[PDB]
């Protein structure tokens, strides 16, 4: 790219717990808990009771220390850079007997100049972290109140004080971890004249016919002369130049302003999954002395992005336009890969968004207790066409709002709003989760004097409605900003669900029954959820047999939710008859989570245009635990995302039973209208006899973008309550010519009142490596298979769906661990086999 040399610092890394003087190898970028659990001085902290057993880790102080050459010609360079991308998070950092850095902000990468401090030969780098507990222990003395931060698990709520992931400290899914570390990547960079300190790509407008594009850098010259240059920019596509720009400049000393318009004509569009191709723009600037001095590429995405938030008849829309078009919002939340950051692996981004590029997603939201995502998550939302909704990390509880508090925050939003403002993905800023719901609602009226309390909400003001917002609005001006998620909604409150974006606590926390998505809806679901236990092989993963109940002491560390397993049962027996055995009940509640949670999905897209967007809680989790994801730590997909998969399929025939009588709507999120359409539906029974003849509605269409009643009946006259115990409806949609576009299933009663025939489910397999296909078949219907194997994170084609009577079923499994002439194991459930 340039004449730079960068020098990774990632080997020959050591640590020592502070006061020993024993050190020991470790790993860079990584956290002190890794290091120990390497060497064997921690146990595995996500197995058994172990969660205990690891604490005292965060109450000691670490160093780290490694020795790096440099030689007599590197020291030549003009410049020497030392960028430390994350230090988690009070670190000391020294380099030959200089104090370099005092960090205090995990969010925040440093860029150090170290030219003038480095030795030909040897050179000693040592870092100091200070227990981000220990140091904010007088700091909470002089405090005299605790914060109300419940997530943080521990007597003192010191979270509050420091900038650092807040799930570190605990989370209702999560291990308390309360790590340290060089926590992203450590980098020396020996270079002549000048580096870009920055190269934001801004977009001044688009059209069909014209992209207009300013390139702003800034260049930081590090020698004292003046330096005449030639900036360019190449904007290329799949390798071929779309237009090259160049301006003369002199730079001077210190900082240096340079702008360059560019154009692309006709420009190619960057669309969200399901609407087109994330088209990816090579954008490319250098820095020319007579030598490419510097050079920083984006990759730029052409698009408009609009959050329109807006008074209207139903109180205050919130949707998002994309390229001109109101865009309804299908994903859901992200929460941290890993107790340990830097433990997630490109893989396991890569895979994650799979996953949500599989199920049909086009949002995520990186919710606020969490961290600002690496470039790489980013990236791979560009690439995807997921749209990305960032929270500040700031969730639940009031923080401080102290001059050097804010300067803290400032510093780290400048930083990420600089770092990820030039990607395709990014399409808003929230200030915080539920700060405003908590400091209206939580109760902290009564917990806190009258002063206290004032000074908490003055104290919101500073933070979320002054220094955020500006900040936004200098540095990404033309991203939406909002305050707070949900900004006014409350799910106890009707009068408040056409205002804004709702977080539906009533189901799960309220008790509320799945059919209340139905009736309660929102102007975009920004939050609801339903936990699950994970799958077997994810129990076994932290549990030994002995400790398979619901209630071991085993089990109960893996629950945060501390009136989680109770409302798990108490929503099965509503709809499901309740297992004897720990295996079936597991298998239950994923089917549960998994059919209660799409019909909410459900209610949200056909609901539209008054619902713009659901995203469910939550996508993932962070280590073996209980949970709202709808993937567990593993990779495993629970039913819930098979079904989020279905519920957000563009086209998707819904029907909708209610007052005894059933609505059929054809929803689409296609850019294209559907004309001269069929829907067929006939009813079954569970022996695969038709009752009846085929239903048909001809002459359909489906505009784009569009939820439509299609049909309606009553059930009366129709099918007797006994045959509402013993069938269902299946329902296809074709085009003029018969070609199926969609299909659905729909059963009449709840599953416990249904009266599912015994039966087996038999299947043929053939078995490769990377690979098996299997065969399914049984004479009656079996519900909600489950097709289980032992193989950790092995993925389905489907799975967690009805197998009709008499008609097979293909279902391919893969993964590198499967080997030829290794016959895997294969355990068929279904909801029959669950009950005597
Ligand atoms: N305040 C409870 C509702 N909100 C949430 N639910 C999740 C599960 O309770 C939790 O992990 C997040 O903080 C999220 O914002
Ligand atoms: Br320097
Ligand atoms: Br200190
Ligand atoms: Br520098
Ligand atoms: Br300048
Ligand atoms: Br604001
Ligand atoms: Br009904
Ligand atoms: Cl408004
Ligand atoms: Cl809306
Ligand atoms: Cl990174
Ligand atoms: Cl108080
Ligand atoms: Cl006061
Ligand atoms: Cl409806
Ligand atoms: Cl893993
Ligand atoms: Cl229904």
Redesign the pocket.
């Known amino acids: 790219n340039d004449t730079s040399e960068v020098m990774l610092l990632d080997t020959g890394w050591e640590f020592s717990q502070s006061g020993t003087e024993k050190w020991m190898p470790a790993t860079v970028p990584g956290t002190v808990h890794q290091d120990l659990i390497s060497h064997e001085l921690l146990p595995n902290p996500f197995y058994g009771m172990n969660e205990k057993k690891i604490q005292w880790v965060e109450n000691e102080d670490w160093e780290y220390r490694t020795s790096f050459i440099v030689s007599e010609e590197q020291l030549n360079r003009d410049g020497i850079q030392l960028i430390f991308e994350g230090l988690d998070t009070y670190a000391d950092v020294y380099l030959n007997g200089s104090l370099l850095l005092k960090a205090d902000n995990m969010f925040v990468g440093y860029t150090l100049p170290v030219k003038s401090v480095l030795r030909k030969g040897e050179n000693h780098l040592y870092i100091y972290f200070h227990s981000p507990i220990r140091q904010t222990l007088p700091q909470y003395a002089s405090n005299g109140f605790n914060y109300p931060a419940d997530?943080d698990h521990h007597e003192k709520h010191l979270s509050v004080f420091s900038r650092k992931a807040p799930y570190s400290y605990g989370?209702?899914?999560?291990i308390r971890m309360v790590t340290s570390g060089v926590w992203r990547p450590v980098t020396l960079r020996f270079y002549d004249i000048a580096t870009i300190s920055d190269y934001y790509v801004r977009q001044l407008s688009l059209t069909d016919e014209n992209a207009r594009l300013s390139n702003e850098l800034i260049v930081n010259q590090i020698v004292p002369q003046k330096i005449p240059a030639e900036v360019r920019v190449n904007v290329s596509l799949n390798g071929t130049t779309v237009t090259e720009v160049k301006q003369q400049v002199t730079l001077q000393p210190g900082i240096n302003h340079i702008t360059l318009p560019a154009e692309v004509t006709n420009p190619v569009r960057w669309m969200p999954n399901g609407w087109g191709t994330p088209t990816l723009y090579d954008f490319s600037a250098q820095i020319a002395c007579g030598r490419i001095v510097a050079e920083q590429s984006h990759r730029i995405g052409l698009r408009t992005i609009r959050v329109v938030n807006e008074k209207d008849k139903d109180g205050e829309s919130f949707y998002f336009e994309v390229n001109g078009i109101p865009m309804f919002a299908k994903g859901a939340?992200y929460?941290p890969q890993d107790a340990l950051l830097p433990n997630v692996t490109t893989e396991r981004y890569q895979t994650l968004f799979r996953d949500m590029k599989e199920a049909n997603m086009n949002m995520v939201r990186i919710?606020?207790?969490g961290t600002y995502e690496n470039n790489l998550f980013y990236d791979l939302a560009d690439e995807n066409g997921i749209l990305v909704w960032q929270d500040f990390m700031f969730?639940?509880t009031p923080y401080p709002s102290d001059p050097t508090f804010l300067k803290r925050v400032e510093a780290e939003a400048v930083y990420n709003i600089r770092r990820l403002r030039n990607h395709a993905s990014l399409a808003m800023w929230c200030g915080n989760?539920?700060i405003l719901?908590?400091l209206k609602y939580?109760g902290f009226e009564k917990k806190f004097t009258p002063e206290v309390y004032q000074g908490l909400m003055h104290g919101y003001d500073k933070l979320f409605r002054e220094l955020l917002p500006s900040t936004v609005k200098e540095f990404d001006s033309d991203r939406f900003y909002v305050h707070s998620?949900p900004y006014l909604a409350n799910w106890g409150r009707p009068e408040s669900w056409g205002t804004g974006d709702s977080?539906n606590?009533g189901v799960?926390?309220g008790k509320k029954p799945f059919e209340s998505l139905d009736t309660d809806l929102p102007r975009f679901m920004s939050?609801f959820?339903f936990?699950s236990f994970p799958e077997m092989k994810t129990i076994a993963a932290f549990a030994a047999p002995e400790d398979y109940q619901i209630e071991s002491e085993v089990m109960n560390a893996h629950q945060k939710?501390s009136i989680g397993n109770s409302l798990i049962r108490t929503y099965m027996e509503r709809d499901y008859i309740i297992p004897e055995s720990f295996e079936d009940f597991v298998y239950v509640g994923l089917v549960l989570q998994g059919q209660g949670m799409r019909h909410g999905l459900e209610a949200h897209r056909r609901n539209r245009p008054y619902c713009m967007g659901t995203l469910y809680?939550?996508l993932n989790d962070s280590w073996p635990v209980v949970?709202?994801s709808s993937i567990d730590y593993y990779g495993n997909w629970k039913a819930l995302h098979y079904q989020a998969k279905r519920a957000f399929a563009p086209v998707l025939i819904n029907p909708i039973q209610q007052n005894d009588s059933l609505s059929v709507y054809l929803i689409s999120d296609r850019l294209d209208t559907m004309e001269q359409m069929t829907l067929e539906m006939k009813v079954v029974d569970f022996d695969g006899k038709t009752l009846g003849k085929k239903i048909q509605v001809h002459s359909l269409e489906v505009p784009a973008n569009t939820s439509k009643c299609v049909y309606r009946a009553k059930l009366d006259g129709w099918l007797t309550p006994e045959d509402c115990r013993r069938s269902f409806l299946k329902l296809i949609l074709k085009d003029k010519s018969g070609h199926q576009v969609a299909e659905s299933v729909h059963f009449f009663r709840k599953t416990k009142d249904l009266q599912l025939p015994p039966t087996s489910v038999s299947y043929q397999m053939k078995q490769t490596d990377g690979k098996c296909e299997l065969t399914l078949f049984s004479s009656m219907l079996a519900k909600d298979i489950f097709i289980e194997t032992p193989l950790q994170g092995a993925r389905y084609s489907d799975n967690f769906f009805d197998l009709l009577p008499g008609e097979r079923k293909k279902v391919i499994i893969t993964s590198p661990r499967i080997k030829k002439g290794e016959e895997l194991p294969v355990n068929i459930k279904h909801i029959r086999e669950t009950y005597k």
């Open positions: 997530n989370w209702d899914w999560g939340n929460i919710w606020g207790g969730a639940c989760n539920e719901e908590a939580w998620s977080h606590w799960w926390y939050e959820g936990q939710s809680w939550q949970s709202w």
